[PDB]
Design a binder for this molecule. Structure first.
Ligand SMILES: O=C(O)[C@H]1O[C@H](O[C@@H]2[C@H](O)[C@@H](O)[C@@H](O)O[C@@H]2C(=O)O)[C@H](O)[C@@H](O)[C@H]1O
Ligand SMILES: [Ca+2]
Ligand SMILES: [Ca+2]
Ligand SMILES: [Ca+2]
Length: 399
């Protein structure tokens, strides 16, 4: 079968559980689409009631920041009449505003501005859908695909620059505050039976090195790359290339969402993470199988310095096998970041800078996560992971 018609293998990660991930493989003739712009994409997807098996081939570059005539939209097109960046900055300067949450005219105007862009860039993917890139140059630019449905395959697409024109200031986010934006490339919001394979995720032509600092903090236009929240379950992400981005993959969005316990069952394998700062992945609650991934970066990089690979969040149950991390000078312990409530990590075969390490033991964590993954394909020796992943991961590697 071609990429449009292929299904997730019956052993290929958590996505293969129960009914598995077949996407729109069973699509009838009238439900196979080829799309090359936002209008065609939105027409093909339809609404949440569009649950018939469907296949969507993406041809070329699809820019999501466009109006109904496909004319590009920017800051001044989305801006609420009452919003002004200068006045926003003046209103919420810690020097005069202090550390209270931004409120009043400018923040309300920014929120409205944000919703205006959201209307264009954010799109829901209905049940029983396969979306695949045709050829080697299929791109989604500025878009945020959201999956709340069951049974969705996304493959062979380069997702670029899910860019928010209206970052929100939060003075309480961290010890010196932070700017936060709303769009990921893909958000799995309660979505189930999902395969994301051979995709590329990056910040396009607007990397964070092109954003200024306000209040001494990066004016952050991006959020996540592939995030999963709100009971998202039975997901395989394989052979993806994540690069040049801050926060990559957050699975479980809140310590308070205890209903995520027993969910967020995600398998990540053969993914490449190059110049990713953090959260690759950051996990709360979930039984997450992380195997044969390759991580490369620098702690001293001027654009996207390495912070950590695995985030051991509250009640996380990461099961890691034969992953390879290449970050000069990094200690075994600092391969991961442990957050309150994170107490356990299974890792075997972890290679740091060519040396076998035990990331869990280096951090005083229990090696018992209470499960062993049965749904997986062949496991590469750590020795071959770097080569295999560099050669095979990302969009434009099949076609
Ligand atoms: O900004 C986000 O997407 C995340 O915010 C929180 O992250 C923390 C900090 O805000 C962030 O700058 C970095 O230091 O990581 C922190 C963390 O991972 O805890 C939330 O905890 C995340 O779920 C996410 O919303
Ligand atoms: Ca944050
Ligand atoms: Ca976020
Ligand atoms: Ca997100």
């Amino acid at each position: 079968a071609d990429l449009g018609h292929q299904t997730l293998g019956s052993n290929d990660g958590w996505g293969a559980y129960s009914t598995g991930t077949t996407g729109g493989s069973k699509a009838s003739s009238s439900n196979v689409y080829t799309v090359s712009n936002r209008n065609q994409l939105v027409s093909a997807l339809g609404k949440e009631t569009n649950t018939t098996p469907k296949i969507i081939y993406i041809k070329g570059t699809i820019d999501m920041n466009v109006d109904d005539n496909l004319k590009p939209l920017g800051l001044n097109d989305y801006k609420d009449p009452e919003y002004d960046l200068d006045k926003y900055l003046k209103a919420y300067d810690p020097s005069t505003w202090g550390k209270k949450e931004p409120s009043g005219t400018q923040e309300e105007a920014r929120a409205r501005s944000q919703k205006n862009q959201k209307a264009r860039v954010m799109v829901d993917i209905p049940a029983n859908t396969t979306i695949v890139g045709s050829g080697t140059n299929a791109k989604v630019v500025g878009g945020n695909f959201q999956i709340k449905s069951d049974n969705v395959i996304i493959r062979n697409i380069e997702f670029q620059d899910a860019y928010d024109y209206f970052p929100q200031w939060d003075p309480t986010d961290g010890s010196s505050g932070n700017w936060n934006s709303q769009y990921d490339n893909i958000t799995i919001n309660g979505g189930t039976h999902i395969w994301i394979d051979h995709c590329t995720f990056n910040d396009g032509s607007r990397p964070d090195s092109t954003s200024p600092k306000y209040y001494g903090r990066k004016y952050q236009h991006h959020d996540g790359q592939t995030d999963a929240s709100n009971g998202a379950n039975y997901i395989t992400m394989s052979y993806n290339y994540y690069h040049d981005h801050d926060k990559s993959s957050i699975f479980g969005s809140s310590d308070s969402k205890t209903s995520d316990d027993g969910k967020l069952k995600i398998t990540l394998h053969h993914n490449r993470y190059k110049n990713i700062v953090q959260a690759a992945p950051r996990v709360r609650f979930g039984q997450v199988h992380v195997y044969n991934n390759y991580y490369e970066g620098s702690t001293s990089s001027s654009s996207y310095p390495f912070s950590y690979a695995w985030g051991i969040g509250k009640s996380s149950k990461i099961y890691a096998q034969n992953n390879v991390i290449d970050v000069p000078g990094l200690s075994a312990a600092k391969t991961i970041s442990v957050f309150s409530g994170g107490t356990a990590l299974y890792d075997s075969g972890t290679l740091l800078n060519g040396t076998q390490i035990n990331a869990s033991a280096a951090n005083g964590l229990s090696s018992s996560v209470g499960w062993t993954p049965s749904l997986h394909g062949s496991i590469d020796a750590s020795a071959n992971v770097k080569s295999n992943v560099i050669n095979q991961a990302g969009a434009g590697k099949l076609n």
